[PDB]
């Protein structure tokens, strides 16, 4: 009947409204089209109404894309192509009606909503930051919900949206006029006789109805300088555009994404061939690349992506408004660069003036590029900058309520630093620290308050990567943890909570990968080759760039830290030579040039350590580093690193550097199987017998009795 | 009750001309001098008794800063009279009177001149941010400063956009207009009124706060120009300019670029009765408040008025004669519509109901803004005599003047009748 | 004696840089924001209690008028705080404090911020009087406006000349200098003092009215730059620039183009004792007088001081600590020389003798102008804390601050010690 969609008569115009009170946001589903069908036919069975308009009367987004648990609802190939052939037949119903129609946008329209949007004759949008217009198609790796890519370049153009529909990234409503998808804009309103946002969703109805009567008697026309140069001009440059794109997609990424080129063949065949006949090619394509081993776990990645952008600890009690960043440098000014714009007062501690110049010139230089790309106004830029004051000694920590240490890592100096920066701080505070190596329970037994100390570890370029990690002692209260993760998600960076251990999670898994980055050049296979060799498997940055990523000075400490405990037998397993690297005094990224450098070779030919021989090709050493990485990534939760490990590699792929289009280190028991990797290291069984030894929990349900982790 | 009182005396206003007529020749401190000499023409005051003149601009013609100093020296004042300008966006004058009454009630001086003077005919189009670095030029260093050059000559424009939100007056105008349910027909009944009364006001010819002077370049005299009446059907055809044609603010029912000046005199009451000039009004309390320029940009007056009624200790409906300042049609009826209901005093302060009820009859009868133009920083120092001679003309004894400014500041002050 | 009192609280001043160093990148409402945030760094006041901030410029960067509004909105103030600028020539700030104390003693508001902000690095070089008529341009009328043209492109310059007499600061400077029998040797003893004390003042490092901030374009921090000591023989070789070499004002002992800002806070005493901040000073009477700009152009302070001593009811020699503002060397000793004799109070008022006798010992010891530069509209709101912390540092309880302005206005007001 009318369970989610309804209209009425006002101005003799059908105001069909979109709402779904069950979830917070509305999703395109079979359960929505099952009633969205038998309304427009009644609109098409009417004659008094001469124009109609649809809108999402629920505040927030417009609609979702494909509903996350419905395309991931497992069904066989003929039905998943039947639904994705039926799903646009209802669009080819309404896109060419005799009675014209108008849609509207006042939200983050994403996914199949453009299918609803640009099929219309005339859409209308609201200029604000909340409304964005993007196509999450390649980001989950598919083709869209009804195949709108066969009328996007009819509308805006092949080269115009060809860098849109597979770049993944969204556009705000401001550039959409200069692009040409939506044509008219209307800015929202402030105060009303009704609350100051409910009128703005009820304002568009009347702007739509004053467009609507004009469409029926044609006072305005829907026929609304670089694309005009293209607009008729492709008789012969045909191959000489998508060939440039054919090698573009494999120079940006590497060739082991079989997803995005499989939307190119659409727009390759949509031009020059049968356009209406082209609407059934993707029916033979959408069922392929959804039922494949490329993006099958990518849906689970998205479930975890939305699943950890949640508070998850009760309710936030006594929210923070001030910060206290102990120490300038690269993390402190770094996390200040992100924790300043969206309403957090910060104070940035330094030792002398001589490093605040290196301080604020991050939080300014990485800020005005933001206004150089016109993503902010020129004025609000500077209020955002002036929310950040930099003290010198101490005057103002009596007002602070949350403290984050940022000093370069040591067990001895910070042990004192927590003892002198305890007295001028109130008792309802939070102390926290971004240690990377040494644990907090070794330093949580010193201060006056035992329970108001957590840990927050960041990652090194703080702007581009997008996650935090929490360090939780025995003594962390629920209010302390909730108040921490409030800063975590108000920060915007997707959180994961970790019960600690000697070496917590990320360096805990990175050093048993980094300790064999020396092992390829331990024989001397020209590790410039290794960059291509490992980016071929899928890692976005090479292992040479990983050791040029971590900083050469902390590499000896993250070698000695768990090597103090158990890193000599299976948190490592090769002779350390990085102290010989720094014996000359190489400086890493601050030396600018990386590794030919003419001095790595003298290390190995110092004394003849590589007479070694084993059949280890490139694929062999790729799976050696990956299988040890997943041996450690399955070692976690065997001691109970957290509650349930399906929360795991939402962290461990998203800042660690693990490739997407590979499901995660906790996700190779499923599409690659524990049986096959145990055959891989059982092929590797007689090599050393010491370091690569597999864990016991995954191995007992590995091969025969078809068991999985949770599936 | 022991604070010294304070008095408005006769308020000279040179008439307002739409830009492009005879004030396109002038110099932005000259009709200051004209209005001030006209003040010294009908006041008969010795020119050495006038104590502390203060003006107010918005443009600040930078060949001569602090306009009031030489603009008093030009009219032959005794130069033992200090002066300063006061620059706000729109209620510059009518910030002049309030700092003057603060200067008087401190009890140190004698009399104040307050005036507001501007010309939007010659807006300042300045040269660039970086070509003016060739000020370093003013024999090889003269070359080497000139050595670095590409084509970056572009005069940057003083786009009147309030800079806190980077958008012009009209976007916020029709936002607040459409937000409080204003139709196009209801928005122009007031536009019809604000000329239909104005032509009758000039017809009877008792709006007599006008001196003439001669423009030195062009021919004869001046008298106000922005008055034209029309019908409602001859207004809705005008396609709106501030936004795409779905919106509801056009150039017919909207302010226009006009130029002019104004002045008055403000006296202590005891010397007003000692010398013997017949006054016009007292000048009682004044609230002075601002609004956050993201939401309530031009919700100027009607967030300020119930803060001044309780300040004086009286009630709304028992006022005798308003006059609210306008800058757009509809804005003033949105400043009728919003506070003739609940929900808006609610949630933007605590627990009042309907504290704005202007009964529309005792409103802007001698046509306010949109009638004879809106100078950008000189209204207000029209408006006080347009309250004073008005409420003398009928009965009544009190009346509030309130105005809105580009930037969120409001202004509101009550004016009492003649002390006899 | 029943008038409410009034209080200066801690007076932030961003340091003054000679033009050409790191403030040649800025934007003339930005170090306003820097000085104001620095005021909100050491005051711990809730940002919603600060009532009515007022600033003062002289240049009025016209892309954003009324500097104080958005310059308070930029520092994250609650925007229920109205603001305005006040523009004079030279004592713009220190006209800010006096209209603030008038605003307080009227008894309607709570606290005042007064500050003065300018940059003479980017002076406004505007385009022409008649090329800006091409504003009429903004399809054949677009041609016909462009049809009339010869070569009349010339940027007219803001030559700082006071316009009432069409001659620069320096002509009137060395006129008044030579008119009161000032030799070149006597004119530069004071120039030696006004650096010799200044370097020692920065050496002991208790001139602590300075916040640093970082200039966003250039490298690190700021601290004052105009301080350089030299010998007397290394000064007389500098050939004078304001007049032909018979004259006696050169660029060594003269003000220089410098940029900077300043702010403070002004509190009512009863809320200063209710909230509990430790004050600095009271702020008693203020005379405010002007001089005719043909003869006594820079005879600013010493025509105003015996009008404020009799206003307060005390005597000259029993003041405890002056500080007179300077703009030229010699000017201040001509403001020593003239009133240490007769004939000048004679014939320019009636019957006093020697009402200026400053004993030179209790003078500008923490070096005033010429020490750390003279910003064109921000001095004064240095000078009050440089009186306050100074007379707290030694004994004594009273002290006058007095300044001269480009145009004949003077300023003089007495400042009392801390109320404990």
Curated annotation (Swiss-Prot), chain A:
Sites annotated Important for long-chain enoyl-CoA hydratase activity: 115, 137
Localization in the cell: Mitochondrion; Mitochondrion inner membrane
UniProt keyword list: Acetylation, Disease variant, Fatty acid metabolism, Lipid metabolism, Lyase, Membrane, Methylation, Mitochondrion, Mitochondrion inner membrane, Multifunctional enzyme, NAD, Oxidoreductase, Phosphoprotein, Transferase, Transit peptide
EC number: 2.3.1.-, 4.2.1.17, 1.1.1.211
Catalytic reaction(s) noted: a (3S)-3-hydroxyacyl-CoA = a (2E)-enoyl-CoA + H2O; a 4-saturated-(3S)-3-hydroxyacyl-CoA = a (3E)-enoyl-CoA + H2O; (3S)-hydroxyoctanoyl-CoA = (2E)-octenoyl-CoA + H2O; (3S)-3-hydroxydodecanoyl-CoA = (2E)-dodecenoyl-CoA + H2O
Consequence the record notes for mutating residue 469 to Q: In AFLP and LCHAD deficiency; loss of long-chain-3-hydroxyacyl-CoA dehydrogenase activity; abnormal cardiolipin remodeling with reduced formation of mature tetralinoleoyl-cardiolipin; sarcomere dissolution; loss of mitochondrial potential gradient
Site residues, Important for hydroxyacyl-coenzyme A dehydrogenase activity: 457
Residues modified to N6-succinyllysine: 10, 24, 130, 177-178, 194, 213, 262, 285, 293, 309, 365, 370, 374, 399, 419, 464, 478, 528, 593, 612, 676, 707
Record PTM Phosphoserine, positions in chain: 275, 378, 598, 704
Record flagged with keyword Acetylation: yes
Residues annotated with Omega-N-methylarginine modification: 358
Modification N6-acetyllysine occurs at: 10, 24, 93, 130, 178, 213, 248, 254, 262, 285, 293, 309, 312, 365, 370, 419, 464, 478, 499, 528, 612, 676, 683, 707
Cellular component terms per the entry's GO annotation: mitochondrial fatty acid beta-oxidation multienzyme complex; mitochondrial inner membrane; mitochondrial nucleoid; mitochondrion
Role summary: Mitochondrial trifunctional enzyme catalyzes the last three of the four reactions of the mitochondrial beta-oxidation pathway. The mitochondrial beta-oxidation pathway is the major energy-producing process in tissues and is performed through four consecutive reactions breaking down fatty acids into acetyl-CoA. Among the enzymes involved in this pathway, the trifunctional enzyme exhibits specificity for long-chain fatty acids.
Recorded disease: Mitochondrial trifunctional protein deficiency 1: An autosomal recessive metabolic disorder of long-chain fatty acid oxidation, biochemically characterized by loss of all enzyme activities of the mitochondrial trifunctional protein complex. The disease phenotype ranges from a fatal form characterized by early-onset cardiomyopathy, cardiac failure and early death to less severe, late-onset forms with myopathy, recurrent rhabdomyolysis, and sensorimotor axonal neuropathy as key features. Long-chain 3-hydroxyl-CoA dehydrogenase deficiency: The clinical features are very similar to TFP deficiency. Biochemically, LCHAD deficiency is characterized by reduced long-chain 3-hydroxyl-CoA dehydrogenase activity, while the other enzyme activities of the TFP complex are normal or only slightly reduced.
NCBIfam families noted in UniProt: fa_ox_alpha_mit
Protein name, entry field: Trifunctional enzyme subunit alpha, mitochondrial
Swiss-Prot record, chains B, C:
Disease in which the protein is involved: Mitochondrial trifunctional protein deficiency 2: An autosomal recessive metabolic disorder of long-chain fatty acid oxidation, biochemically characterized by loss of all enzyme activities of the mitochondrial trifunctional protein complex. The disease phenotype ranges from a fatal form characterized by early-onset cardiomyopathy, cardiac failure and early death to less severe, late-onset forms with myopathy, recurrent rhabdomyolysis, and sensorimotor axonal neuropathy as key features.
Name of the featured protein: Trifunctional enzyme subunit beta, mitochondrial
Catalytic residue positions: 90 (acyl-thioester intermediate), 404 (proton donor/acceptor)
Gene3D superfamilies according to UniProt: 3.40.47.10
Gene name per UniProt: HADHB
Annotated InterPro entries: Thiolase (IPR002155), Thiolase-like (IPR016039), Thiolase_acyl_enz_int_AS (IPR020615), Thiolase_AS (IPR020610), Thiolase_C (IPR020617), Thiolase_CS (IPR020613), Thiolase_N (IPR020616)
Cellular localization per UniProt: Mitochondrion; Mitochondrion inner membrane; Mitochondrion outer membrane; Endoplasmic reticulum
The keyword Transit peptide is assigned to this record: yes
A Gene Ontology cellular-component term: mitochondrial envelope
This protein's UniProt keywords: Acetylation, Acyltransferase, Disease variant, Endoplasmic reticulum, Fatty acid metabolism, Lipid metabolism, Membrane, Mitochondrion, Mitochondrion inner membrane, Mitochondrion outer membrane, Transferase, Transit peptide
Organism for this UniProt entry: Homo sapiens (Human)
Functional summary from the UniProt entry: Mitochondrial trifunctional enzyme catalyzes the last three of the four reactions of the mitochondrial beta-oxidation pathway. The mitochondrial beta-oxidation pathway is the major energy-producing process in tissues and is performed through four consecutive reactions breaking down fatty acids into acetyl-CoA. Among the enzymes involved in this pathway, the trifunctional enzyme exhibits specificity for long-chain fatty acids.
Subunit-level organization: Heterotetramer of 2 alpha/HADHA and 2 beta/HADHB subunits; forms the mitochondrial trifunctional enzyme. Also purified as higher order heterooligomers including a 4 alpha/HADHA and 4 beta/HADHB heterooligomer which physiological significance remains unclear. The mitochondrial trifunctional enzyme interacts with MTLN. Interacts with RSAD2/viperin.
Superkingdom, taxonomy of origin: Eukaryota
Site (Increases nucleophilicity of active site Cys): 374
Intramembrane segment boundaries: 125-166
GO MF terms held by the record: 3-hydroxyacyl-CoA dehydrogenase activity; acetyl-CoA C-acetyltransferase activity; acetyl-CoA C-acyltransferase activity; acetyl-CoA C-myristoyltransferase activity; enoyl-CoA hydratase activity; lncRNA binding; protein-containing complex binding; RNA binding
The protein's Enzyme Commission number: 2.3.1.155, 2.3.1.16
A GO BP entry: gene expression
Modified-residue entries (N6-acetyllysine), positions: 24, 239, 244, 278, 294, 307
Class of this enzyme: transferase
Family listed: Belongs to the thiolase-like superfamily. Thiolase family.
Residues the record lists as N6-succinyllysine modifications: 24, 218, 237, 239, 278
């Amino acid at each position: 009947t009318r369970t989610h969609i309804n209209y009425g008569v006002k101005g003799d115009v059908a105001v069909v409204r979109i709402n779904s009170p069950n979830s917070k946001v509305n999703t395109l589903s079979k359960e929505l089209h099952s009633e969205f069908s038998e309304v427009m036919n009644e609109i098409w069975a009417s004659d008094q109404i001469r124009s109609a308009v649809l809108i999402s009367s629920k505040p927030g987004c417009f609609i979702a894309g494909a509903d996350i648990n419905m395309l991931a609802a497992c069904k066989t190939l003929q039905e998943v192509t039947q639904l994705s052939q039926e799903a646009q037949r209802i669009v080819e119903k309404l896109e060419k009606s005799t009675k014209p129609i108008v849609a509207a946008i006042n939200g983050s329209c994403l996914g199949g909503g453009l299918e609803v949007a640009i099929s219309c004759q005339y859409r209308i949008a609201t200029k604000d930051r909340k409304t964005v217009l993007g196509t999450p198609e390649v980001l989950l790796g598919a083709l869209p919900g009804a195949g709108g890519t066969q009328r996007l370049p009819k509308m805006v153009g092949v080269p115009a949206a060809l860098d849109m529909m597979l770049t993944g990234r969204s556009i705000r409503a401001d550039r959409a006029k200069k692009m040409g998808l939506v044509d008219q804009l209307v800015e929202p309103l402030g105060p009303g006789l009704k609350p100051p946002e409910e009128r703005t969703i009820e304002y568009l109805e009347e702007v739509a109805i004053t467009f609507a009567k004009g469409l029926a008697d044609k006072k305005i026309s829907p026929k609304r300088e670089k694309l005009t140069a293209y607009a008729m001009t492709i008789p012969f440059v045909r191959q000489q555009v998508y060939k440039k794109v054919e090698e573009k997609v494999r120079k940006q990424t590497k060739g082991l994404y079989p997803a995005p080129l499989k939307i190119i063949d659409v727009v390759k065949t949509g031009i020059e061939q049968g356009s209406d006949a082209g609407y059934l090619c993707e029916s033979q394509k959408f069922g392929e690349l959804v039922m494949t081993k490329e993006s099958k776990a990518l849906m689970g990645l998205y479930h975890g992506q939305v699943l950890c952008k949640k508070n998850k600890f009760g309710a936030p009690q006594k929210d923070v408004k001030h910060l206290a960043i102990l120490g300038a440098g690269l993390m402190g000014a770094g996390i200040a660069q992100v924790s300043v714009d969206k309403g957090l007062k910060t104070i940035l501690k330094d030792a002398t003036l001589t490093a605040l110049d290196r301080g604020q010139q991050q939080v300014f230089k990485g800020l005005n590029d933001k206004v150089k790309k016109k993503a902010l106004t020129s004025f609000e830029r500077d209020s955002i900058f002036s929310n950040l004051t930099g003290q010198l000694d101490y005057q103002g920590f009596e007002k602070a309520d949350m403290v984050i240490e940022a000093v370069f890592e040591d067990l001895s100096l910070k042990h004192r630093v927590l003892k002198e920066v305890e007295a001028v701080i109130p008792d309802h505070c939070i102390f926290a620290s971004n240690t990377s190596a040494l644990p907090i329970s070794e330093i949580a037994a010193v201060s006056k308050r035992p329970e108001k100390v957590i840990g927050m570890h960041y990652f090194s370029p703080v702007d581009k990567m997008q996650l935090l990690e929490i360090i939780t002692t025995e003594k962390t209260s629920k209010d302390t943890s909730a108040s921490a993760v409030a800063v975590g998600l108000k920060q915007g960076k997707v959180i994961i909570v970790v019960k600690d251990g000697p070496g917590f999670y990320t360096t805990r898994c990175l050093a048993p990968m980094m300790s064999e980055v020396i092992r390829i050049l331990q024989e001397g296979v020209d590790p410039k080759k290794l960059d291509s060799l490992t980016t071929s498997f899928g890692f976005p940055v090479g292992a040479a760039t990983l050791v040029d990523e971590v900083g050469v000075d902390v590499a000896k400490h993250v070698a000695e830290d768990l090597g103090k405990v158990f890193g000599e037998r299976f948190g490592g397993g090769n002779p350390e030579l990085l102290t010989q690297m720094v014996s000359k005094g190489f400086l890493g990224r601050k030396s600018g040039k990386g590794f030919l450098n003419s001095d790595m070779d003298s290390i190995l030919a110092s004394l003849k350590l590589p007479p070694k021989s084993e059949v280890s090709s490139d694929e062999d050493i790729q799976f050696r580093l990956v299988t040890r990485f997943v041996n450690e990534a399955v070692m976690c939760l065997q001691e109970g690193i957290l509650a349930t490990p399906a929360e795991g590699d939402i962290g461990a792929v998203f800042g660690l550097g693990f490739p997407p289009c590979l499901g995660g280190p906790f996700r190779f028991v499923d599409l690659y199987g524990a049986q096959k990797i145990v055959d891989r290291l059982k092929k590797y069984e007689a090599a050393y017998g010491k370091q690569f030894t597999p864990c016991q929990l995954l191995a007992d349900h590995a091969n025969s009795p078809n068991k999985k982790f949770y599936q | 009750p022991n604070i010294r009182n304070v008095v408005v005396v006769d308020g000279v206003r040179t008439p307002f001309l739409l830009s492009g007529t005879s004030y396109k020749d002038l110099m932005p401190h000259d009709l200051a001098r004209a209005a001030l000499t006209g003040l010294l023409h009908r006041t008969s005051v010795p020119k050495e008794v006038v104590d502390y003149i203060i003006f107010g601009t918005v443009i600040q013609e930078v060949k001569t800063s602090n306009v009031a100093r030489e603009a008093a020296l030009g009219a032959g004042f005794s130069d033992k009279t200090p002066a300063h300008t006061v620059t706000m966006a729109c209620i510059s004058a009518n910030q002049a009177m309030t700092t003057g009454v603060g200067l008087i009630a401190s009890g140190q001086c004698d009399v104040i001149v307050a005036g507001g003077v501007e010309l939007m005919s010659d807006v300042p189009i300045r040269h660039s941010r970086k070509m003016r670095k060739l000020m370093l030029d003013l024999g090889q260093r003269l070359s080497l400063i000139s050595k670095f050059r590409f084509n970056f000559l572009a005069p940057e424009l003083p786009a009147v956009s309030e800079f806190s939100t980077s958008e012009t007056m009209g976007h916020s105008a029709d936002r607040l207009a459409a937000a409080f349910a204003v139709s196009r027909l209801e928005q122009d009944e007031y536009a019809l009124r604000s000329h239909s009364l104005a032509k009758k006001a000039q017809d009877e010819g008792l709006l007599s706060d006008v001196v003439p002077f001669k423009v030195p370049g062009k021919d004869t005299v001046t008298k106000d120009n922005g008055i034209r009446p029309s019908s409602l059907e001859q207004m809705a055809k005008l396609k709106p300019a501030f936004i795409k044609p779905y919106g509801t603010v056009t150039a017919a029912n909207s302010s226009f670029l006009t130029d002019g000046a104004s002045a008055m005199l403000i006296m202590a009451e005891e010397k007003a009765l000692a010398m013997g000039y017949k006054p016009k009004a007292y000048l009682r309390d004044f609230m002075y408040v601002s609004q956050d320029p993201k939401d309530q940009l031009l919700l100027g007056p009607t967030y300020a008025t119930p803060k001044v009624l309780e300040k004086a200790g009286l009630t709304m409906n028992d006022i005798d004669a308003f006059e609210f300042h306008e800058a757009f049609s509809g804005q003033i009826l949105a400043n009728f519509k919003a506070m003739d209901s609940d929900w808006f005093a609610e949630n933007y302060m605590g627990r009042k109901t309907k504290v704005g009820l202007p009964p529309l009859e005792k409103f802007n009868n001698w046509g306010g803004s949109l009638s004879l133009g809106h100078p950008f920083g000189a209204t207000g120092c029209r408006l006080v005599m347009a309250a004073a001679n008005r409420l003398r003309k009928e009965g009544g004894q009190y009346g509030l003047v309130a105005a809105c400014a580009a930037g969120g500041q409001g202004h509101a002050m009550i004016v009492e009748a003649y002390p006899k």
